[PDB]
Amino acid sequence: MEVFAEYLAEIENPDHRARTQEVLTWVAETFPDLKPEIKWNTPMFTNNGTFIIGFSIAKQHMSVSPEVAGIERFEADIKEAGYSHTKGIFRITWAKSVDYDLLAKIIKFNIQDKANYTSFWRV
Description:
Elements: H1 5-9, H2 14-30, E1 35-39, E2 42-47, E3 50-57, E4 61-65, H3 67-80, E5 90-93, H4 100-113
Antiparallel strand pairs: 1-2, 2-3, 3-4, 4-5
Helix pairs in contact: 3-4
InterPro entries: YdhG-like (IPR014922)
Domain YdhG-like: 16-111
Protein name: YdhG-like domain-containing protein
């Protein structure tokens, strides 16, 4: 968790910082075997060296990054949760709640789908 200290401190809005902290803490606690990392100024979690999920903050939303394959697998549920998405990310605006249930399904999916992966990113 200390790994994310500087990143969180740099979030000037304290309510945005609290939400980011709550999500990152929840991932860490719910998935204790993942390694929390800051890489390229992005908070993320890896499993035996491969990327599992990443988070980043913009002015009006948090971005969740589970790779294109993660968005493809859960596109219907992302849309039903009410979040906007691209091919590779989806967004949670500050007024909207975080669907921890969906996050859990995405994270578990990437863990299983990238078991033994030989690269950091999916190609």
